Amino acid sequence: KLLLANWGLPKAVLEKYHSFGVKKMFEWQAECLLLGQVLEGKNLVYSAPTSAGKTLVAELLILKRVLEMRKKALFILPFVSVAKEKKYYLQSLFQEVGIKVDGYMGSTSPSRHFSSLDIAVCTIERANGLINRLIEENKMDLLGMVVVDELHMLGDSHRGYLLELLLTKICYITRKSASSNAVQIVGMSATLPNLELVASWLNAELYHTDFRPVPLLESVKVGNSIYDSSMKLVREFEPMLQVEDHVVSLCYETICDNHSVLLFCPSKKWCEKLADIIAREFYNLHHQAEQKELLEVMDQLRRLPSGLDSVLQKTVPWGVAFHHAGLTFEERDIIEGAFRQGLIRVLAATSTLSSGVNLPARRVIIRTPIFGGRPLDILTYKQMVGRAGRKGVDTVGESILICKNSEKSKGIALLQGSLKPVRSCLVTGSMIRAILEIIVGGVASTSQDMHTYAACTFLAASMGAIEACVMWLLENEFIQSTEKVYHPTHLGSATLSSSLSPADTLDIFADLQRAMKGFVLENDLHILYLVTPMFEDWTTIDWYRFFCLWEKLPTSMKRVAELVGVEEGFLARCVKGKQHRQMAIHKRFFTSLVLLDLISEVPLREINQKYGCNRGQIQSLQQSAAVYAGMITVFSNRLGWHNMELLLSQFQKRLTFGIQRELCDLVRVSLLNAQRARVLYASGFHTVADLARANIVEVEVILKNAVPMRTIWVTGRKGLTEREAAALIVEEARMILQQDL
Amino acid sequence: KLLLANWGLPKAVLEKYHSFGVKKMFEWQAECLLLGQVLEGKNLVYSAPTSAGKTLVAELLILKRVLEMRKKALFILPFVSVAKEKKYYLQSLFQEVGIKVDGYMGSTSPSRHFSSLDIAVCTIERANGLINRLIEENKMDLLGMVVVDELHMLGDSHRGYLLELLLTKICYITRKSASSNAVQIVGMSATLPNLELVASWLNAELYHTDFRPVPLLESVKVGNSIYDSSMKLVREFEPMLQVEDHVVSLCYETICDNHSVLLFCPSKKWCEKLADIIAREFYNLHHQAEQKELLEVMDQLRRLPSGLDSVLQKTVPWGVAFHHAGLTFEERDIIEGAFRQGLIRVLAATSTLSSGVNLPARRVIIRTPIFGGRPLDILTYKQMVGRAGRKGVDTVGESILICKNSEKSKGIALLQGSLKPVRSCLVTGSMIRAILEIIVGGVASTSQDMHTYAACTFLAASMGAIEACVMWLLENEFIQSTEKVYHPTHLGSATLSSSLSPADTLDIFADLQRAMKGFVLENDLHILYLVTPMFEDWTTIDWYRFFCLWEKLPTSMKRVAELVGVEEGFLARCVKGKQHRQMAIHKRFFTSLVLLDLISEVPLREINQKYGCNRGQIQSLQQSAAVYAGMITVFSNRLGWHNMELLLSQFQKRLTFGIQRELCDLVRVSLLNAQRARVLYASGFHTVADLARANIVEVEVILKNAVPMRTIWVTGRKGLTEREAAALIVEEARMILQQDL
């Protein structure tokens, strides 16, 4: 029974599963999938280590649900990058079966309707919106199963509470319809201490396991000695070659064993220093002073829109590199992609890689127990050390945390500690949106029926302020009260449909209605100023630069500032020598200035040295501001503002790819991000129409030129050959036009 | 040789010509078509009376040109209504031949490209723009023949000068390309005294004839006697029944002879009085106190968007009616259509019908020699009296002009007078556009080459200020000068492409750029305020109403007024008790207010009693403001303003049909003007897509209701049955979607 072909599976899916190297099913997976009555409708929650094969159980369950009862199945993932990876994996597994898979990851939206789709690999922030849309116009029959990844995120997190509200809405809808099951909620988590309470929250059966494909031997350093988890020496450390910490040696010993190493570092600047240091040691310690495939990685990074990083130039062709937030989104994918093939053997990464894609390694080394002035989180530590040990190759997995002097006490607590139990995070902004997500949906109107929903939440299931949320919504016109029955309003129907927090919608409605009387149209700044999300922590603002920004702006760009409350008298002037709502406007104004150059196709290299924020912190905004333009536009339609939806209709597409209005039709094909379309635009193909009929060999020469074998990089496809990439552009264009009419 | 089938013609065209009652060719037409070498390339100009068969020669020539050398052939007509009639006639003649005919009449634009088209039945104002577009991007090879109707209009007229510039541009292009002919210019005119000079202007051969199918016996009244043209009594008048002028008797004598009468009147108010008077006499003089088809006309006018006119209620079912400018555009077509079938036997019309469609009658009576305080124009008189005598039925044709006391001297001069020779009307606004139409087109750049064009104009060919036009264009940035070679600018390339007079473009560029900094989006007023043409003489403005207009406008509509220079202190306030640019703003503001209700689908009955201007003067603006929005939008694209072209893209379609943004896709089918789409919209079909797939029998019931056998009226199709009209809606929708992709 522990064999995949024995289980009922499609032939093509099984063959592709062999192609991915998965053909042996562990005992824990079979036991979880044989937990009695789970399969035929009841929801399920299980825990396993990060490398135990958590995905396979969910994939088998969603396959069984899909081919048994035809119904749309969700797939919730916490991060956009992992969501894209999961969608591509599911497509590569499900091409033939006819299960059309596509995802809703922030800026991007499917061309085909959700009814045509069958599996929606969606992020939490947009899965909430999709389920709100489904619940709105009574389309619940299509949904048949919601799959959630990393259930433990529903605690203290910026987006796990959205997952909590989504799951409680689904549970309440299921309970109210019964006054074996319509929608099955299957989730995966780490070693959650209170998973029984979570399992009872959805009344799901629980199966917790600690099976690991390879043993994990966590260890700590003391001078020239290594101590195991339980304060026990396991191996007497000795240095091989170095020119107390000796962090370069631990990489070296694994290097001579023909394996790889992950070297997590606290800060990006530390990552650049550490990657450079290890590269220099590879000169003297290996030369006393695959290569061919490693040069291909260099070639792929050479004609990236940002070019090749200066620090990466002196490090990459040695198996030593670095990968953190400040790097480009395309640069990160290549560097991570090189690790999957083993081309790069050392990665000096930050804490961002902890929650990233599945990146295996033989050894994991963590430089400091303090990350950004605070002790490193246990949840992050478990995710970091969960990457030690490659399945089927490495016989063991080692994690080495470096602690010094008095800091060793904090380090030891991490090894013997356990991840904290989940919380509720529920007046509060989470409950206000929770209440508004139902009444405007019309599912529950009466207070008593609404109070039933309050008993279906996570806070109630763990074992006042619920009615206070209504009183806040009533005072702000969001919901009107009649004989008490609560009805949605024009503003309320817009907050829910656009998927905005009610705290923000109040200001946006006042901010957008401040554009009722005064507007400009020469420059996109004022229109862009209405789609900048916030200042948050996207970058550090340099005011002396803003002094240069303010004067050199044309006579129009300064006019926009006066129209939005920005004062010329105090603009980078009084800050040098030394109001919360006013400070959040000048910083918001600066955020709009950067986005203006982003849609003007100013290259990221220039925009970095000009606005001081590197490409990592800039794509962290344009892919976050593109979603904002996709919610302000929806906010206007539900409020009956057809004038500005027309203006803001194309600004989500212009911010996602950083293009102008000319390439809007051209960037529809997925193989032209921001440079493969302009160089193709200059060749005379101004629309996706004639590009489909364009000559196959003609587009080869145009893509060859304009350089700032598989050197062309494609989103989600790693690197691609120049001939293959250009051949797929016309092939994809033919399908795009054919399926759109 | 005087027989159509003898001439080389397609079989289907010949059969349709028999269907239209034209099978005998007069001697003058054959002589004109056998004027030696005219046929194989040389242009032609000929004159004939209004009923002599002027169209047939042009139709034969354009047919020969089209089937001999495949090339696009123009068809220029002076008025929009006659252009629509000519386009429909040409389509009804040319369905089978494959000659795709379509017209460019102001607001409407062809869905198919001009390259697909073969005959463009275009008005002068848009024929000029089409030829400018053709000359711009060197597409002159497609054009092979330009046909012009009423050549004599190129004199003192508001749009004949555009025809003059068009023809001189064509002639200059032909002459410059020769440094039997590419483009043949064939035109028709009345008895122009100086047609030889016009014929030599295009070097065309001239054939002037005075043949008339029926003799015309013009006559004048004196008390109870009738005098012929040459001061000779021809018949002693006697009154039959009346309850000196005795204008009701002349209708009566023709009535008992089973014929019809046209009774032209000076003013609309006179027309209502005269039509009512004759109807009352038909009570006592015919009852001492076809009917079935006459009631059908009443039924068609009963559910018109404006309903049935009060004055028409007491007059229509007796053969007596009236038709002037103040009536609805749809009302005029039915009243005129009833005359073609003979249902209505008396028409009290104004001078507007003189240049309208071909409306024949047995007798024509003109009430006064003074029209609006001035002597009646001889050109109008010839057009008015040219409708006397129906070909093949009436043995004679009579025109009776009524003169009294000392006014008889002026009346006699009209009978013995002749139509004045054409003029040039060429600093002047006609020459400024003439010069700009070429240099921005790039055809002529050097001054000497430009001076060659000045010798190809009508003023030169009849036998300084040409260089002064360049000096005016240079001072206003319209054209830049280098080493002298004149180049177009950004503003210059927009004035020519949008087809605006350079005098107006200077203000529009300043007016539109006054919207650079201050704009509103809640209401369409400010956007509509940028597309109102002018105040002109569209209606008389009542200021006390504007006082009611100003206060009851919302807090936003008053904000728009402040943004465009309108002052609250002086707004319908100082005019009651008693600046040219300021007066043309408040009047322009009032023009925008009316258009706001026009796009809000406020019914014409309410909008008449609310804004005091009847439906005749209101559709005289919305079909003139729709063209303006079609030129402001083009003016923005050539000037690189993509923000407001998006806002103004749909405002030409919203003003042509007076619809909202919901029906924009629905009104694409020609059988839904402004009421057949809303009542169909309320049935659930929100788009032209599902309307094509809509059930045939289902749309029958929805069109039957909402009434404010062939009762449904279709533009250009007279009246249509309810079953046929609804059946064609789905049939047309199927072809619209199929041919658009």
Ligand SMILES: Nc1ncnc2c1ncn2[C@@H]1O[C@H](COP(=O)(O)OP(=O)(O)NP(=O)(O)O)[C@@H](O)[C@H]1O
């Ligand atoms: N029974 C199995 N035997 C061998 N390999 C397996 C088995 N089951 C799953 N796998 C694979 O081994 C990996 C261990 O599972 P797991 O690491 O939890 O997935 P994951 O990292 O969460 N993938 P993702 O959702 O994209 O982040 C899976 O991702 C599969 O690639």
Ligand SMILES: Nc1ncnc2c1ncn2[C@@H]1O[C@H](COP(=O)(O)OP(=O)(O)NP(=O)(O)O)[C@@H](O)[C@H]1O
């Ligand atoms: N040889 C002919 N014999 C009989 N009828 C003719 C002949 N030639 C033309 N006709 C028709 O008699 C009418 C007299 O010509 P004419 O009145 O000048 O056309 P029109 O009124 O200018 N048509 P339009 O261009 O739509 O305004 C034509 O319109 C034709 O309908």
